[PDB]
Design a protein around this nucleic acid. Structure first.
Lengths: 39, 120, 47, 189, 169, 111, 106, 134, 121
RNA sequence: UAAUUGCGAUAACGAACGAGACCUUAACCUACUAAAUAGUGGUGCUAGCAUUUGCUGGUUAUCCACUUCUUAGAGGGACUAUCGGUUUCAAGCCGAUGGAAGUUUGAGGCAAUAACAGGUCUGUGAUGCCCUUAGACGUUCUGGGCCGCACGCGCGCUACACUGACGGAGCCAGCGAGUCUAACCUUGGCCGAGAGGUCUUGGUAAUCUUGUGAAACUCCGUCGUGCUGGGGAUAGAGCAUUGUAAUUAUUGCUCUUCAACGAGGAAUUCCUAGUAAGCGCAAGUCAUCAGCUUGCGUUGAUUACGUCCCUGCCCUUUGUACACACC
């Protein structure tokens, strides 16, 4: 109930995000903008 | 110009120089040196001997045996002053004994709490 | 801006003459005007 | 704000995946889904949507049904349907799924790609690049290109044609990695 | 932006030796007329990092710096930055090693400026009179630059800069 | 009368179409609008709610070198509401029409 | 050109108090008393929550019922809003003192 | 009717009497004072043609202090000259105008400045943080 | 009023505090062991003390003492234990330490360093 | 010229990428499209002081209509625009008028071709190969640990105070963000010196909490340039608040202690205007935690003919062992 809460794409329990809930920017910073995250 | 024990203050406004009253401070000054019916406005060498008597009352009789204003199973609390350092040692001593990773640390000389000391 | 020439005005009828200026070891442009010593092209100016 | 985007960053791409794998034996090309009133509709655009679309039928109901339970909801809401891919040449995953499956299959990745190049371009499309950037046979590491046409990934809005994407390339020696590009719309629709 | 007026409004339209006036209320060669100087006196005052109070500063410095032996205040302020600029200091050489430094103008707007933030400075550096009147140091020092326009008495380096760029010339 | 508005003030069967594109969706703003300038009630309802812009920033490149770069990307939710009729003794069919996919529709019909 | 009505700026608060805990009586039986900060003091705070008519009636724990005195006299209602309206003695009991202050400038 | 560098002042125009209230006050007050003029200096500024008139007054509000002050500024004379003819001057309203802007910068339209922009850097904007790797 | 707030110390504390009857818990005082903030305790209670209990004692053996070890730097200054010996670990430690009532101070695993090695100074 | 940006030369001629253009943002406008309407301003009901009414204010009722204001759709708008100067052969440069805007609108995103063995198997259920197996380098569970402090180097935070600190008072910002559980965002009532406890409460677009308690800042008053009342390190006690857990360090509050530090060597950082600089808040972080960071508004400079030299880069020419290319 704290620092452990996976990250959908690759469990990499370190770096996950806010509005969404997946992440990490790991599996976002090119695998989201079209998934989507425009810009 | 010479209150509470060795404490020999003066020259600097009522309830302001009563901080230089080793032990006494920015609110003690007010509350104490105020409930004295003492005109906080009043200054240094000038002050009612009935004051100082009483400023040593409230602000050193409440601010000593009381903090119960100045009159009437006690417990109860209390502060310190020129009997401060002594008691400090007292408690750093109550500690210097049963041993505290943040107590024996007063003896040894590391900072007491938190203190990510590995720089300053 | 080495003060150019000093074309004053007659004799005692000139609070002060004028003087063009530009630069050699820096700038370079047309000018004149503000200064009333009495040096010369021997002396110089800055830009 | 809840779902919306998040809802896409959800079931959308999250779909894309199963719509990228467990289906590539048939060659996927994307996917679009919307719903009427609890009418969740997958629109799986396939290159070879045949049995890939219903060998006696089992394709869809099989997958489709999984795609239900999986991303769990539907029970009748979700519903999928096989479309007919565009004129292959483009949408990246086309000839990239190709090479991806070619060097893979066997062809010398010399002219192997020289094809997809000279074939996307061939299906009419002002040329198109596609470098192979793996461990070029036994050796160190490097890459090589392949193009002829136009483009330059400049600020033509979102390229505004350039429809490039990269894929796996998991050979037994390492991981080369395919990445084609297309000059796309020479101005049409 | 962003000062006031009145308070005296003694507008001496003369006092402007050398060039100057052709830029006594200017900036250009690089502003325009950044309100008749006293918009920069008041501005060169923002040496903590924010105008206003700065604005006050100026004003107080004024009523004060005129009340005290009035010279029309504004004309003390003009006649402040007036007889109180640099005039052809040196500036490096490069012709040596190990330079030397030769001298000359003094691009007017300079003379005004380089004396503006300067008188400004001498002010700022209270420490005499280390009173509590910022506008006093700002005045007197500027006043000791009006009355001081009778030697020395606050500027000083005023001279220095010039009373030096003669020898090493 | 002191309020950017206060949306809302929502009508008329509510029908708020809330989406993430524009022309290629909110074309069905003209649609739904003019699809009623015929006979339909008074439609005080082409209410634009303001550009909602969700933005996720996240400095660039896994790892450590660089400067870290820092790219901050977007994905903007726009969303408006139309006021057809309130309940209307004329409904149905005029109950959820059109279908520009990716725009999210709205019922209610009050009050 | 011009006036103030309930307005008149600052001293118009250095008034309602200047004439509250001066023309006392009172409510401000405040027992928070001495310990809490400052000076004199603190009907000023009240000549604050006072001018707090312009607002809340349409826009710490000393405060937490420094309201309780105003609402026991100089307006300050339970407000169906949820705060305090300048009660009976309205922009009135105030408006007055404000007047007094007005002609009191001279 | 006029906003100022993140602030914004609204204009009231229809002939009346004295006491022109800003916000809901009186351009006597306007207490973020010091330079409390430059507000009473639009009305004063009427020093060029008129003396005060006999009209109206409205409220401002946006961004912060001196911002607002500078806003209410245009606000006024950017509303004396109000069209007219019921506000400005029923003819040749360049009466004020060209006069109330032959030394203006408030009614003299607004300034093309407005806060924004930073940088993947330090503070941002342009001041990029101070680093000195060895 | 006219003080009571905070004046340096105190209360009848440290001094007249837990010390308030050094023979207090010599009677119990159980929850009363908690008669002095600022900590404890949204729960109540434990169980492992059953060894310090009918084991640490239980003979007597008038040479008072006992093993009684348990990783538990959580277990707070009893003081219903009053005196015994517990294995105040540090990982590879379980160091020994009497539980003298004299000091119902800090936490079990507190009076038994896990640095122990400040290094040359 | 910001540009291999153009002119100009000319055996070249004609051209594609890149720059540009276009995308986004920030500004202006329409008297187009309505919105509640910022109400521009009026209507009823209503409270207050005051001979019209100002001076106000509430408030649910019908009105309206449209700027303020607002939201955002669809277009317009700038193009170095005139004019003059002057390179003259023009691209341009420049000064003045003057536009919301001035020659590069401010800003950002995209960013070709080559190059580095740069850094990332500690971000992937990306992977070659090597290693590793019921005494496991797998995963778990318990405890410490990354926080251990003679000392070095760096990014900072706040301070040396009179443009100040200190108490009362005046005001007003923007980006933003948040629940089905449930300790989401939190208004209001009470209790609480304070932390906070709290009874309720609104609220998946501007609806409710934030602009209506931002701070720097303005005014009024106290301190007397004295390591004071600047500053607040360190420790003494206590009270509360996150979590199973806070001793090992934990977050806030309450008293007392009160040190360095009297503007900083040699170096060196960064920036030319809605900048710099100061002041602050939202968001990421999250149970709790910001001295970080991305942002965002608030006040609100001084500076220039610039090219001179030190540093970098470039372009040629010029020399050249090589050319896996001066590792």
């Amino acid at each position: 109930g704290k620092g452990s809460r996976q990250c959908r794409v690759c469990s990499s329990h370190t770096g996950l995000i806010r509005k969404y809930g997946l992440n990490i920017c790991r599996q976002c910073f090119r695998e989201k903008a079209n998934d989507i995250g425009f810009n | 110009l010479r209150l509470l024990n060795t404490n020999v203050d003066g020259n600097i406004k009522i309830v302001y120089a009563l901080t230089t009253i080793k032990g006494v401070g920015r609110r003690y000054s007010n509350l104490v040196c105020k409930k004295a019916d003492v005109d906080l406005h009043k200054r240094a060498g000038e002050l009612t001997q009935e004051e100082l008597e009483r400023i040593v009352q409230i602000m050193q009789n409440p601010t000593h045996y009381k903090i119960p204003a100045w009159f009437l199973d006690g417990k109860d609390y209390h502060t310190l002053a020129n009997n401060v350092e002594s008691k400090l040692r007292d408690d750093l001593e109550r500690l210097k004994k049963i041993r505290a990773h943040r107590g024996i640390r007063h003896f040894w000389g590391l900072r007491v709490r938190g203190q990510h000391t590995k720089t300053t | 801006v080495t003060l150019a020439k000093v074309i004053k005005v007659l004799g005692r009828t000139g609070s002060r003459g004028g003087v063009t200026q530009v630069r050699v070891e820096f700038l370079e442009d047309t000018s004149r005007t503000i200064v009333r010593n009495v040096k010369g092209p021997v002396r110089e100016n800055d830009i | 704000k809840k779902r919306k985007l998040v809802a896409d960053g959800v079931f959308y791409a999250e779909l894309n995946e199963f719509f990228t794998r467990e289906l590539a034996e048939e060659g996927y090309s994307g996917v679009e889904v919307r719903v009427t009133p609890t009418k969740t509709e997958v629109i799986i655009r396939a290159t070879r949507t045949q049995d890939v679309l219903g060998e006696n039928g089992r394709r869809i109901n099989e997958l489709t049904l999984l795609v239900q339970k999986r991303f769990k909801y539907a029970p009748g809401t979700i519903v999928l349907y096989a479309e007919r891919v565009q004129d292959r040449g483009l949408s990246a995953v086309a000839q990239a799924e190709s090479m991806k499956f070619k060097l893979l299959n066997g062809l010398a990745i010399r002219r192997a790609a020289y094809g997809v190049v000279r074939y996307v371009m061939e299906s009419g499309a002002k040329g198109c690049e596609v470098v192979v950037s793996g461990k070029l046979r036994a050796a160190r590491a490097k890459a090589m290109k392949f193009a002829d046409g136009f483009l330059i990934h400049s600020g033509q809005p979102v390229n505004d044609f350039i429809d490039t994407a990269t894929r796996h390339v998991l050979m037994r020696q390492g991981v080369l990695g395919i990445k084609v590009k297309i000059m796309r719309d020479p101005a049409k629709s | 932006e962003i000062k006031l007026f009145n308070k005296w409004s003694f507008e001496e339209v003369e006092v402007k030796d050398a060039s100057l006036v052709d830029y006594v209320q200017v900036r250009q060669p690089q502003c325009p007329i950044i309100e008749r100087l006293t918009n920069s006196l008041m501005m060169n005052g923002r040496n903590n990092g924010k105008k206003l109070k700065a604005v006050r500063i100026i004003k107080h410095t004024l009523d004060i710096i005129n009340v005290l032996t009035d010279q029309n205040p504004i004309q003390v302020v003009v006649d402040a930055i007036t007889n109180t600029g640099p005039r052809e200091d040196t500036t490096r050489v490069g012709g040596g090693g190990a330079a030397r430094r030769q001298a000359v103008d003094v691009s007017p707007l300079r003379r005004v400026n380089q004396a503006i933030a300067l008188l400004t400075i001498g002010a700022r550096e209270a420490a005499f009179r280390n009173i509590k009147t910022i506008a006093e140091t700002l005045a007197e020092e500027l006043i000791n630059a009006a009355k001081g326009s009778s030697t020395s008495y606050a500027i000083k380096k005023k001279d220095e800069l010039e009373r030096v760029a003669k020898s090493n010339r | 009368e002191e309020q950017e508005q206060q949306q809302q003030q929502i009508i008329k069967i509510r029908i708020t179409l809330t989406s993430t594109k524009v022309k290629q969706l909110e074309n069905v703003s003209s649609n739904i609008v003019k699809n009623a300038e015929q006979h339909n009630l008074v439609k005080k309802g082409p209410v634009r709610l303001p550009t909602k812009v969700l933005k996720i920033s996240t400095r660039k490149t896994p790892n450590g070198e660089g400067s870290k770069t820092w790219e901050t990307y977007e994905m903007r939710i726009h969303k408006r509401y139309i006021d057809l009729e309130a309940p209307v003794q004329i409904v149905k069919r005029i109950t959820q029409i059109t279908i520009e996919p990716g725009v999210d529709v709205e019922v209610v019909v009050a009050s | 050109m011009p006036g103030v009505s309930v307005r008149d700026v600052a001293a118009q608060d250095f008034i309602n108090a200047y004439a509250s805990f001066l023309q006392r009586q009172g409510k401000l039986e405040v027992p928070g008393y001495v310990d809490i900060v400052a000076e004199g003091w603190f009907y000023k705070r009240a000549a604050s929550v006072a001018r707090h008519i312009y607002m809340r009636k349409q826009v710490g724990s000393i405060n937490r019922k420094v309201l309780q005195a105003l609402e026991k006299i100089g307006i300050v209602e339970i407000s169906p809003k949820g705060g305090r309206r300048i009660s009976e003695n309205g922009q009135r009991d105030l408006d007055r003192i404000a007047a007094q202050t007005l002609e009191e400038d001279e | 009717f006029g906003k100022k560098k993140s602030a914004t002042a609204v204009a009231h125009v229809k002939a009346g009497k004295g006491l022109i209230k800003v916000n809901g006050s009186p351009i006597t007050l306007v207490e973020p004072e010091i330079l409390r003029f430059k507000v009473y200096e639009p009305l004063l500024l009427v020093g060029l043609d008129k003396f005060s008139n006999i009209d109206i007054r409205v409220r401002v509000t946006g961004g912060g202090h001196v911002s607002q002050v500078y806003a209410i500024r245009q606000a006024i004379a950017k509303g004396l000259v109000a069209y007219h003819q019921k506000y400005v001057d029923e003819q040749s309203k360049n009466e004020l105008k060209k006069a109330f802007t032959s030394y203006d910068r408030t009614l003299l339209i607004a300034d093309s400045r407005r806060p924004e922009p930073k940088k993947f850097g330090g503070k941002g904007a342009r001041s990029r943080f101070q680093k000195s790797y060895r | 009023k006219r003080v009571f707030k905070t004046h340096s110390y105190r209360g009848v504390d440290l001094e007249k505090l837990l010390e308030m009857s050094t023979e207090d818990f010599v009677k119990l005082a159980p929850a009363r062991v908690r008669r002095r903030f600022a900590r404890g305790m949204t729960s109540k209670p434990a169980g492992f003390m059953k060894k310090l209990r009918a084991a640490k004692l239980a003979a007597p053996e008038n040479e008072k003492p006992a093993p009684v070890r348990t990783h538990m730097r959580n277990m707070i200054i009893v003081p219903e234990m009053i005196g015994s010996v517990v294995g105040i670990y540090n990982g590879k430690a379980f160091n020994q330490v009497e539980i003298r009532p004299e000091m119902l101070g800090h936490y079990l695993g507190e009076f038994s360093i896990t640095y122990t090695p400040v290094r040359h100074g």
